[PDB]
Structure formats: structure tokens, C-alpha cells
Coordinates of C-alpha atoms and ligand atoms in Angstrom, one line a residue:
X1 CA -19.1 -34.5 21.1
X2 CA -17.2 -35.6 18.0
X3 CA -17.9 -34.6 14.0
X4 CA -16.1 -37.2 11.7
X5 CA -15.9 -36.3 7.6
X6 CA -14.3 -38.0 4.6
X7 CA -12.5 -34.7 3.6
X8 CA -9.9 -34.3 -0.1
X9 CA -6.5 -33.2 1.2
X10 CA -5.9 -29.4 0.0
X11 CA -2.7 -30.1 -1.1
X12 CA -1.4 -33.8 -2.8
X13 CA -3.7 -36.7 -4.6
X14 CA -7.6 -37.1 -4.0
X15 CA -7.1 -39.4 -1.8
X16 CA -9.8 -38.9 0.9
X17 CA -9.3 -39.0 5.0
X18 CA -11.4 -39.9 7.5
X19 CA -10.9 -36.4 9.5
X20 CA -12.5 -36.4 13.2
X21 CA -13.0 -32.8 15.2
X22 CA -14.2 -31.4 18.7
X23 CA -14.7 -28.6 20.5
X24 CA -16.8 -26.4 17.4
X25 CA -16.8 -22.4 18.9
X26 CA -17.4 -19.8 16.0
X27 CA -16.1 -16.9 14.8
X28 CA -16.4 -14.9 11.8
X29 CA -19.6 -14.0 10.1
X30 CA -20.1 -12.3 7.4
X31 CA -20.4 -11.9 3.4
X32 CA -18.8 -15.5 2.9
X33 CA -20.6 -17.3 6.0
X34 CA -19.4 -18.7 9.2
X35 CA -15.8 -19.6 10.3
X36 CA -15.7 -22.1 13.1
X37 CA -12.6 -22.8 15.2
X38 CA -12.0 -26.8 16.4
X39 CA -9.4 -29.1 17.5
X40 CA -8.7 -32.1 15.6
X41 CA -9.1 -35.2 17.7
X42 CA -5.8 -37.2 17.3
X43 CA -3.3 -34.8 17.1
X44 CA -5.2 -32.1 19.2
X45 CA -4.5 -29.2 16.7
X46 CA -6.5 -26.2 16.0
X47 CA -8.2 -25.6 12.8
X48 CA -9.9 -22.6 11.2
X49 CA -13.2 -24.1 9.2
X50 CA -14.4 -21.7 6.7
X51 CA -18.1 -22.7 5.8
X52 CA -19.8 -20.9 2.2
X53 CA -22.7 -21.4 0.1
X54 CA -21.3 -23.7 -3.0
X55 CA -22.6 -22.1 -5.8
X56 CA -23.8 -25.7 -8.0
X57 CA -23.3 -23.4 -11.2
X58 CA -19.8 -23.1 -11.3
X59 CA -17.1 -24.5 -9.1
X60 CA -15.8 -22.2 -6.2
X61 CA -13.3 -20.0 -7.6
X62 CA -11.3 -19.4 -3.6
X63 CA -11.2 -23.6 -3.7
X64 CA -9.6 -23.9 -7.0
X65 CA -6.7 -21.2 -5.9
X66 CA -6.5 -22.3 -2.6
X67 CA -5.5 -25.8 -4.0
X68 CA -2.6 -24.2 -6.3
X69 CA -0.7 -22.5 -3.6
X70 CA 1.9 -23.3 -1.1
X71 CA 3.7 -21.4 0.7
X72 CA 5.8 -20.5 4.0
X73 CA 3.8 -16.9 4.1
X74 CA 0.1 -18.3 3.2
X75 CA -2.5 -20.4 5.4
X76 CA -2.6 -24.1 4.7
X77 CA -5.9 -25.5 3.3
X78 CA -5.2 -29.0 5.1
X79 CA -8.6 -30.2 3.4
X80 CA -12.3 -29.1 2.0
X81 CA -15.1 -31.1 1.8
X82 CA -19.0 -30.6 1.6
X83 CA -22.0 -30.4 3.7
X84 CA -24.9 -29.0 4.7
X85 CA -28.0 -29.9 7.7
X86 CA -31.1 -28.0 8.2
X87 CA -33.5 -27.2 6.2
X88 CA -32.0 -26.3 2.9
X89 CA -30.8 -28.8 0.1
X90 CA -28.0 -26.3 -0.7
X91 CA -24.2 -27.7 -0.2
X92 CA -21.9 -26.0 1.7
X93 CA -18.4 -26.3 1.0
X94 CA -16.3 -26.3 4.1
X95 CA -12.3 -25.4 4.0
X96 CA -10.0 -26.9 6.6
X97 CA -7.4 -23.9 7.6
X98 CA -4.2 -23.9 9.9
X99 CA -5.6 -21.7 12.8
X100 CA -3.3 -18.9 13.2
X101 CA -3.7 -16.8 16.6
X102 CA -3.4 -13.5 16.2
X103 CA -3.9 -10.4 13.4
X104 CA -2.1 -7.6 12.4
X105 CA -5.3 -6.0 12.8
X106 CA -5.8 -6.8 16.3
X107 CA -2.4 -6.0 17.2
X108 CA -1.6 -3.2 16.1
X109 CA -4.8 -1.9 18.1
X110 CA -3.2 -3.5 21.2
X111 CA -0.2 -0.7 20.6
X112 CA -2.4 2.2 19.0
X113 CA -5.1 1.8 22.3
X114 CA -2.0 1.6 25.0
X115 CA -0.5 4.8 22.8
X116 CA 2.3 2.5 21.4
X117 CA 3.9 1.3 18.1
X118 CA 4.9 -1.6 17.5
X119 CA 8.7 -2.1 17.4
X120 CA 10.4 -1.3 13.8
X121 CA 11.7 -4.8 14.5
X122 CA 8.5 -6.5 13.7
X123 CA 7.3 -3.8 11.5
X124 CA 10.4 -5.8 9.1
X125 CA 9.6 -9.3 9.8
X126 CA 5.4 -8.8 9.0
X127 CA 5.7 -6.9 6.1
X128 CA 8.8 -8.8 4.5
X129 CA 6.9 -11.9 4.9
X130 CA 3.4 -10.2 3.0
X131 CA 5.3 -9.2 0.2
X132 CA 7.0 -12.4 -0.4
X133 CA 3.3 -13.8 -0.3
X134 CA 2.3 -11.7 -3.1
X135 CA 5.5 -12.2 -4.7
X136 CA 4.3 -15.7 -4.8
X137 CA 0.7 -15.6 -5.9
X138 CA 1.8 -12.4 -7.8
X139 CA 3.6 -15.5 -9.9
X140 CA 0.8 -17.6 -11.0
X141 CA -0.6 -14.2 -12.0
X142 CA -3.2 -14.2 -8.6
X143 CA -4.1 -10.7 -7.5
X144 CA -5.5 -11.3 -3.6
X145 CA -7.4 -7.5 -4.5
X146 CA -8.3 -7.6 -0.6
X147 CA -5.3 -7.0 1.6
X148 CA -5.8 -5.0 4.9
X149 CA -4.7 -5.6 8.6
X150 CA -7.3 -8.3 8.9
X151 CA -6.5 -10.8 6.7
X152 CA -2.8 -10.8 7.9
X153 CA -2.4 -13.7 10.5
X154 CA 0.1 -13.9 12.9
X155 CA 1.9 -16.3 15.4
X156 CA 3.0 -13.9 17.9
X157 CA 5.9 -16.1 19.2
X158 CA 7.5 -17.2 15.8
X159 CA 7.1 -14.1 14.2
X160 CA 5.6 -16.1 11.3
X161 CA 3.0 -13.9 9.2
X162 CA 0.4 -15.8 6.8
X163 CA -1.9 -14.2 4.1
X164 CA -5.4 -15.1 4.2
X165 CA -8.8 -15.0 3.0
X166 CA -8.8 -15.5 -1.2
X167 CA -12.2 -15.1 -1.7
X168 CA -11.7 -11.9 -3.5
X169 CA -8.9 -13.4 -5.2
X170 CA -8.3 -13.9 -9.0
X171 CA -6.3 -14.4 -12.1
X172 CA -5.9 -11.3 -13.6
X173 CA -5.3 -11.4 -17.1
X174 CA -4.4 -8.7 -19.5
X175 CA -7.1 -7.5 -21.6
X176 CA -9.9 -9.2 -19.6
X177 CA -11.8 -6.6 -17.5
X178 CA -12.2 -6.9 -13.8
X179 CA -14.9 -5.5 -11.3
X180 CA -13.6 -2.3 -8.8
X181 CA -15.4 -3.0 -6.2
X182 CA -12.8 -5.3 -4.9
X183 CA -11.0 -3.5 -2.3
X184 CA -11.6 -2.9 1.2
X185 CA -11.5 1.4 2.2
X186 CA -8.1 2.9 2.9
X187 CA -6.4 -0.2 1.3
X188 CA -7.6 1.2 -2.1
X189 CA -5.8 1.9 -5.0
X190 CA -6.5 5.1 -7.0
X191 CA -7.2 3.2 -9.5
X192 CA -9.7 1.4 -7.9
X193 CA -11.4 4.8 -6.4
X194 CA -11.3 5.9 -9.8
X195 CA -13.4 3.0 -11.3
X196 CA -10.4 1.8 -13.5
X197 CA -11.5 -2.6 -14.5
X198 CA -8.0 -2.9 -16.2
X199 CA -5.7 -2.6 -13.2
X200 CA -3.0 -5.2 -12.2
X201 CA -1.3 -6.9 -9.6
X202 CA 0.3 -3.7 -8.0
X203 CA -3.0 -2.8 -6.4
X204 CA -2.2 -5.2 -3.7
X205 CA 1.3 -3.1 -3.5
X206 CA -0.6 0.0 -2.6
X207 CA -2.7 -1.8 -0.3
X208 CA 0.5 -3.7 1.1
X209 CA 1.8 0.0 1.6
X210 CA -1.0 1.4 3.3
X211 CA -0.7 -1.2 5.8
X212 CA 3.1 -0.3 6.0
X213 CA 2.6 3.2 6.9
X214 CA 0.0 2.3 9.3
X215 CA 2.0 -0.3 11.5
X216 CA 4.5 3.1 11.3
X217 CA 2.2 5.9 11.8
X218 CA -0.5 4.4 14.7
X219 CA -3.4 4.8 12.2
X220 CA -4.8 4.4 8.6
X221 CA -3.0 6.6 6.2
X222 CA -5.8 7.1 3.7
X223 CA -8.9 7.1 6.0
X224 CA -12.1 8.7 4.7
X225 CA -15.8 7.3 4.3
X226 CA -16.2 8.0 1.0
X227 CA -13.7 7.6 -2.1
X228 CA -13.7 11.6 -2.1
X229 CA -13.0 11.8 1.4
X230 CA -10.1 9.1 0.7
X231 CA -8.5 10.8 -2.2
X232 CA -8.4 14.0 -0.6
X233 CA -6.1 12.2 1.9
X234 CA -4.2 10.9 -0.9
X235 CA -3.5 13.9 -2.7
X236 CA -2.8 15.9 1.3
X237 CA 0.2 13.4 0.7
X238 CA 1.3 12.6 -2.8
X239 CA 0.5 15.8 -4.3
X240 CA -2.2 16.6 -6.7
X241 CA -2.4 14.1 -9.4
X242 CA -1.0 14.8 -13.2
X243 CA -2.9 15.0 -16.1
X244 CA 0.1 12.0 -16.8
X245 CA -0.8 10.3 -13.9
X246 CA -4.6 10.3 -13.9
X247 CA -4.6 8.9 -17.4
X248 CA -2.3 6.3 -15.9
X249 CA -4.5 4.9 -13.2
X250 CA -8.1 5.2 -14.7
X251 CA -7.8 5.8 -18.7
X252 CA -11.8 6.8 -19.1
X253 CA -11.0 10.3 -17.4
X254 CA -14.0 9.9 -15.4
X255 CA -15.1 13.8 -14.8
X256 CA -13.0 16.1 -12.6
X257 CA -10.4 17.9 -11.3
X258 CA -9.1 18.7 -7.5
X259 CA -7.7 20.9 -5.4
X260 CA -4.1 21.8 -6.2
X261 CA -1.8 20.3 -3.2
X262 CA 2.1 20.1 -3.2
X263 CA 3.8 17.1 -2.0
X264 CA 4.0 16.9 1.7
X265 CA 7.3 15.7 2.3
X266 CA 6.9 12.0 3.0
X267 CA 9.7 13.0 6.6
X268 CA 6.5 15.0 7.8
X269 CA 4.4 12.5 7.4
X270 CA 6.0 10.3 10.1
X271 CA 6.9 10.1 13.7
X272 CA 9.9 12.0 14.2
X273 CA 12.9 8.8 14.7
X274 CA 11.1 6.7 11.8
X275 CA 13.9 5.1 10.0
X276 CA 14.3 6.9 6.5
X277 CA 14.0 3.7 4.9
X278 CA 10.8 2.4 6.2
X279 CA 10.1 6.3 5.0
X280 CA 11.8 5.8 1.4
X281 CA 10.1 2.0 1.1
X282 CA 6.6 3.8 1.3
X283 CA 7.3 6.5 -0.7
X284 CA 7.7 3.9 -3.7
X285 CA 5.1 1.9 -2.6
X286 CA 2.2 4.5 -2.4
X287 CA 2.7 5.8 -6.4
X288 CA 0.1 7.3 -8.1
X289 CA 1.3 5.7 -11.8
X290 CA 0.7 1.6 -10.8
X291 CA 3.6 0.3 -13.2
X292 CA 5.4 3.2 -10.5
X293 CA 5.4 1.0 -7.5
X294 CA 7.9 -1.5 -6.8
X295 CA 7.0 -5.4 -7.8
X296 CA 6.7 -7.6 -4.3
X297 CA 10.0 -9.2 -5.0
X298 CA 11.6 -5.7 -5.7
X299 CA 10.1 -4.9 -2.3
X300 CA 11.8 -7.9 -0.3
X301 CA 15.4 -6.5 -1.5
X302 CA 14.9 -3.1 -0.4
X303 CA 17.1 -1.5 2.4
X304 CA 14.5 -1.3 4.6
X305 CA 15.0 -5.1 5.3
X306 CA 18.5 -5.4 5.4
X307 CA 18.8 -6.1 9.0
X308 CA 16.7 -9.5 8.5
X309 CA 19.4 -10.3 6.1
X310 CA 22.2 -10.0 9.1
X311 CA 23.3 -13.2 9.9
X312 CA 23.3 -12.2 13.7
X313 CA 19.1 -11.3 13.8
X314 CA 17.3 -12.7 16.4
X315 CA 13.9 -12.4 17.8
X316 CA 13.8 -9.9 20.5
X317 CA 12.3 -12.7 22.5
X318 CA 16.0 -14.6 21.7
X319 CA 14.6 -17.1 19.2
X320 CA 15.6 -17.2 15.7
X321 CA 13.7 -15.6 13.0
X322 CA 11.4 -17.4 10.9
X323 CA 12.2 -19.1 7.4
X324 CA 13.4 -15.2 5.3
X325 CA 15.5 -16.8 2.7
X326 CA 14.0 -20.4 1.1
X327 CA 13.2 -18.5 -2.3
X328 CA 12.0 -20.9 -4.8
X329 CA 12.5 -20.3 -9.0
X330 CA 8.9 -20.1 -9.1
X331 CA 9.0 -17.4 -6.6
X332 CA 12.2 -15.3 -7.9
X333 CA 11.1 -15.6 -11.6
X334 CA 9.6 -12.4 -11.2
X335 CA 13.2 -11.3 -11.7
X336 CA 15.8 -14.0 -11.1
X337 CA 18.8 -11.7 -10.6
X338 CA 17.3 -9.9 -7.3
X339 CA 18.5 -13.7 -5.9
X340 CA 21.9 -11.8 -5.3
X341 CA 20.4 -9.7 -2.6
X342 CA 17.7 -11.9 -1.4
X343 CA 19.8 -14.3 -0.3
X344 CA 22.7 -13.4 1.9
X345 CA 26.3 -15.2 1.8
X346 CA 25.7 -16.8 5.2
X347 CA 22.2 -17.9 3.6
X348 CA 24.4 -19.8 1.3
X349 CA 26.9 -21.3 3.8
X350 CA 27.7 -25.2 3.2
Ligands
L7R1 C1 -10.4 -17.4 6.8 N1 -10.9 -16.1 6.5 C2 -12.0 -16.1 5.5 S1 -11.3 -15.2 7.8 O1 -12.7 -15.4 8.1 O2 -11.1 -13.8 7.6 N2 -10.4 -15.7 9.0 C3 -9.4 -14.8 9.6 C4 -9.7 -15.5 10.9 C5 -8.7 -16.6 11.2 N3 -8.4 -17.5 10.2 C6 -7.6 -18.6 10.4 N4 -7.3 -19.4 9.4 N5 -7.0 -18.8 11.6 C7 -7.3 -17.9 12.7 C8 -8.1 -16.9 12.5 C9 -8.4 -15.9 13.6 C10 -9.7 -15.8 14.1 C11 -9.9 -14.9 15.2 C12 -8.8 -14.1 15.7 F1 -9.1 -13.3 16.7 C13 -7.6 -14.3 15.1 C14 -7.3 -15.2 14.1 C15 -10.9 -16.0 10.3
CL2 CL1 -9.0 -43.9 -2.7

């Protein structure tokens, strides 16, 4: 059994392909719609098709993003096209997607169920490679305003990490107001908890931090069931918020005041032979005050990362690491000048 579609290429001209598929399993489910795995029939590569309601009102806002990006770090849309079947007369619109293996998610449960962590090693490469993706999309002024474990794909062998899943995504632009219901739990921002609709780009930095700590510590930092049950977890580490900072996050002061915590001292927070940068990296991460938190690009140049920047690196499985250092201006304009560290002498070698 064989499905063949004229499908637009993600990326390049509309100039449509005749695009032939087998072996449809599913996966998925949920909010968006399905997500089928298949195997594309000439060159026997596995794709990821993401199937979703198309709206007929306005055009699909994940599409129109999805088509702007590229980038080492972020899942290819190869191609979209539209469909539907059954009794409906509603399109679907159905994105083509590199099929990446693995999760973060599901393996850092591998090492937290066998009473593991995973080694510091690829603690570096993983989270180097997500903040270079936001660094990215951070660019073009694209918040992702979902990142967690799940949405963090992985190749096992090549180390390669690729964001994914923009259908929370957006262009956040100042003065506009945006909806806080965005995030998923324990990869919230205060700000978000706190109901705050004119936050930035650095919520994906706390989220990108809460998923740090966790690949460190075994387990969500900030877990809880309810945003109060989240923020007391919050404050057990940061300290109780002040009066500075709480205006900071959410302006409208929503109604209260909490307990009165000191700082726990980020050191006891961690396993006892955590490296004091990975320590120091989350430290500035997880701020309550969101201008506080390092950019994504600010992130990639921190110490923590220094041994991906040694020329002698290598996989532990004795392959070279992936693509660390292929900045593009786009990428660095953030903050040209961070080039310097970013890319290492032997990076440079001619
Ligand atoms: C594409 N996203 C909307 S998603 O539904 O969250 N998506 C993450 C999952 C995904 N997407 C892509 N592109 N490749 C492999 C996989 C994947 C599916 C199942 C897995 F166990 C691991 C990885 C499915
Ligand atoms: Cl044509």
C-alpha cells in the first residue's frame, strides 16, 4: 500500500512534488490531531506527518513559521499539503517532518527509572544545541512559549538535538498582548503563573532552565499541580520574591503575598559532584526579574560549555560532535561580539 500527494516544499519555490509514502503507523494524539510516522518510497526515509484541522478563516499560523525557519537545531518541514477523507468537508493540512528517534523526555526517564543520570557530557551537547534554537527563532522575534522535555528530539548516535512542535509558537511584539496560558506545568515562567500577557522571549529561558536542572537533578525542578503548588517550589529555591521583582514579572499586582523563604543555596540544590557551572548556568537562567536571565546566545558562551569548544571533544561513542560552531549573522545579531567566544581559534583554522 502506497499514498502519493502533490505536496509545496517547506523550504524553496512553490514548486510542487509528486511525494509517494508507505508503511502509515501513528503516533501522537492530542490537542493538534494525529501524527503519523511513514517511509518515503524512493529514498526509504522516515517522516513524521503532523495532520490538523485547517482553520478556512485564517491561514495556519505553525505553517507560516515553520516555512521561515532553518536551522541545524530545528526539525525540517520537508513539505505540507492538504487533505482530508471521511465524512467531513473540512481540510486538513498535513506537515511533512524529518522523523527524529528519540526525546529528551523519554530519555531522561530511561536514566531516572534505572536510578541514573545522564552523563554531564550530553547534558552540554542537548542543551547547547536548544539554546542556539532559540537563539535562532529568538531572532525573527518567535517565542516557541512551549518548551519541555518532549518537544526536544534527539538522534541518539549523533548527538544532534532538534526543537519541535510550533504550534504554540508566535511573534511576540512589544506592546501587543499575548494569552498566559501558553506554557506547559513546571516549564512555567513566573510570569506566566502570575497571569502577566506582556512577557517576552526569556520565558522560553526559564523553561530552557527548568529542563537544565532536570537532566541534572533526575526530576522536575518546579513540580506541583497547581500554579500555587509550583511557586511554592519556586520560592523553596529562589527565595521569596521582592516587591521589585514581583512588579517585574506581572505588573497588575495580582492579590497576595507568601511565605517568607531565604535562598536555598543553589550547591544544595544539586547532587553532590554537579559541576559548579552547570550549578552557576541555572542560577542565571531561573531569575525571577525576566530581563534577569541570560539571552540564548549569552547562554551558548557560558563556561558551562567550554569543553564543546575544545578542539579535542569527541563523542563518548568516538565520533565527532555535531555541527557547535556554523553561527550565522542572522543568528549572532543578537549580539555580534559574543562571536569571539562562540567560535573557537581551531573553529577558524584555514
Ligand atoms: C511534531 N509534534 C507536533 S509532536 O507531535 O510533538 N512530535 C514529537 C514526535 C516526533 N516528531 C518528529 N518530527 N519525529 C519523531 C517524533 C517522535 C515520535 C515518537 C517518539 F517516541 C519519539 C520521537 C511527534
Ligand atoms: Cl510548477
Amino acid at each position: 500500500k502506497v499514498t502519493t500527494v502533490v505536496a509545496t516544499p517547506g523550504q524553496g519555490p512553490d514548486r510542487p512534488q509528486e511525494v509517494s509514502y508507505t508503511d502509515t503507523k501513528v503516533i501522537g494524539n492530542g490537542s493538534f490531531g494525529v501524527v503519523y510516522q511513514a517511509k518515503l518510497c524512493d529514498s526509504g526515509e522516515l517522516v513524521a506527518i503532523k495532520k490538523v484541522l485547517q482553520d478556512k478563516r485564517f491561514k495556519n499560523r505553525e505553517l507560516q513559521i515553520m516555512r521561515k525557519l532553518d536551522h541545524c537545531n530545528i526539525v525540517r518541514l520537508r513539505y505540507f499539503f492538504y487533505s482530508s477523507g471521511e465524512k467531513k468537508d473540512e481540510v486538513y493540512l498535513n506537515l511533512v517532518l524529518d522523523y527524529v528517534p528519540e526525546t529528551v523526555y523519554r530519555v531522561a526517564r530511561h536514566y531516572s527509572r534505572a536510578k541514573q543520570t545522564l552523563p554531564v557530557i550530553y547534558v552540554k551537547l542537548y542543551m547547547y544545541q536548544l539554546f542556539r534554537s532559540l537563539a535562532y527563532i529568538h531572532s525573527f522575534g518567535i517565542c516557541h512559549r512551549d518548551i519541555k522535555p518532549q518537544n526536544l528530539l534527539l538522534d541518539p548516535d549523533t548527538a544532534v538535538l532538534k526543537l519541535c512542535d510550533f504550534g504554540s509558537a508566535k511573534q511576540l511584539v512589544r506592546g501587543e498582548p499575548n494569552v498566559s496560558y501558553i506554557c506547559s506545568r513546571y516549564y512555567r515562567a513566573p510570569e506566566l503563573i502570575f497571569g502577566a500577557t506582556d512577557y517576552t522571549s526569556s520565558i522560553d529561558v526559564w523553561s530552557a532552565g527548568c529542563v537544565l536542572a532536570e537532566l541534572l537533578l533526575g526530576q522536575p525542578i518546579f513540580p506541583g499541580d497547581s500554579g500555587v503548588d509550583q511557586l511554592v517550589e519556586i520560592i523553596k529555591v529562589l527565595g521569596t520574591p521582592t516587591r521589585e521583582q514581583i512588579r517585574e514579572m506581572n505588573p497588575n499586582y495580582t492579590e497576595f503575598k507568601f511565605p517568607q523563604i531565604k535562598a536555598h543555596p543553589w550547591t544544595k540544590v544539586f547532587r553532590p559532584r554537579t559541576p559548579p557551572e552547570a550549578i552557576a548556568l541555572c542560577s542565571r537562567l531561573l531569575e525571577y526579574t525576566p530581563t534577569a536571565r541570560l539571552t540564548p546566545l549569552e547562554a551558548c558562551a557560558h563556561s558551562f560549555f567550554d569543553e564543546l569548544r575544545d578542539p579535542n571533544v569527541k563523542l563518548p561513542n568516538g565520533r565527532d560532535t555535531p555541527a557547535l560552531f556554523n553561527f550565522t549573522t542572522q543568528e549572532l545579531s543578537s549580539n555580534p561580539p559574543l562571536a569571539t567566544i562562540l567560535i573557537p581559534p581551531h573553529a577558524r583554522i584555514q
